[PDB]
């Protein structure tokens, strides 16, 4: 018989209230629980009334899985959730942070630092639109993006996930949100959640707040800054996210002035909810509540109390769900956490689910599987990669011929370096694995492959990963393209003191450029020590982490398009200067924010 919450014609708030009024405390606490697919089974999902699942980095049904395999996984979990008494569908989240990057064959877009270099918010919106389609190709409805961190110290291992050290650029790139979710209607109230329907995904502004601040660039640590600095650097892009209807916000592992974000009622409830009027749901980071305590996990009862009372709505447990549900149930039953707090959390979670159409379309659309890796999206990623490139040098003296653009017809050319033919390295972190990987880890085009696809048929292309100087001098080359840089990383292994690229990288550039004129392509997540690379090179391009479409690099090297990218952050002279930002008394950059040379298309 008729149940108001099941009626798709009714207003979202009426459906939320109708469902909430029917729910037991177990059904309510279940909605607030997000678990890893690695611990999920149909019985676990039904018995514990689970509200959400995720894949963390690298959590996949198998290596090489097709889009249909992901849809079958997500639907198998959804069938269990739809079989509960109330039939509340789960929402499945994943880090689709530069495309649907855990998935084999997904288009991999440039990381956010390179997107900052484009200064093109419409390009970023189009990337959100394409990412939503590739996430929905795999049956998933929720992406943990954008990271709107304002990275103020490039020693941070996640600096490549920040569009810029300048909050104005980060604010402009919140256009990712209506890409992913759809544009909000003209009448829209700031802070409400929005998703247009089954071809879009819920988004997540992360990590709230000051994740880009931290002392020594140390990940998951203390950001020391006064309120004016928190509010003028780290917070503004959250208001833009409210204006664009971001559906969820994820809290940072970081602390602000010694207070853990996951326990900060003043910021999570007083500011985000009560001042910005955010009406979507607030989600923890991975074991974020565990890390409220030192050591982490040493008083999980307190972690649950502190986080839920701070105003978090959904907890990314993600493994110990039985303990989580047991502890929260105990707190509620003991009067330590009031029912009004549970009811607010569930109201917000249900509001996002109903608003996005999840009750109407809980299952995957098999017709969407073919969106994965679509050529139109690879053409977009190629455009973005080319626009992200920043030309740092194009001739050793003011009187030399500019090396770039290079001619496509030459008798023989050399492609060299550890990063010339390594797809994993050109994608960086958060690609297939959490920390990324080496070699041909997915479908794409390396810089070597892109050169071979670009050049005249008469041009002989020789590859040598690490040639010695004599090989280059004897090879009869017209010029060389040498690609080197950082290996893939995230915070842990990415948080780095010295910011010097691994060897051999510099040695290869010096060997190659000593023998023939060279264009050096530097692959990195951030500024790295660069004076020695510059001294050896005729031309040098900061290519950041350009993703699967290596032809974006060659589109500018061979002059099909001019270089237009500009630094979205300061390039330091030495790591001893750090942190070093505009307005600091010691500001003395090698290249300033906004620097970049240009070429004209040939
Ligand atoms: C590119 O073209 C413009 C005129 O259209 C010219 O002013 C500029 O100097 C050229 N730039 C380069 C790098 O040749």
Automatic annotation (TrEMBL):
Domain Glycoside hydrolase family 3 N-terminal: 24-352
Keyword Hydrolase: yes
Domain Glycoside hydrolase family 3 C-terminal: 389-598
Keyword Signal: yes
Sugar-bearing residue positions: 221, 498, 600
BP terms from Gene Ontology: carbohydrate metabolic process
Superkingdom of origin organism: Eukaryota
Molecular function per GO: hydrolase activity, hydrolyzing O-glycosyl compounds
Keywords: Glycosidase, Hydrolase, Signal
Paired cysteines (S-S): 151-159, 513-518
InterPro entries assigned: Cellulose_Degrad_GH3, GH, Glyco_hydro_3_C, Glyco_hydro_3_C_sf, Glyco_hydro_3_N, Glyco_hydro_3_N_sf
Protein name from the UniProt record: Beta-D-glucan exohydrolase isoenzyme ExoI
Species per Swiss-Prot/TrEMBL record: Hordeum vulgare subsp. vulgare (Domesticated barley)
Taxonomic path: Eukaryota, Viridiplantae, Streptophyta, Embryophyta, Tracheophyta
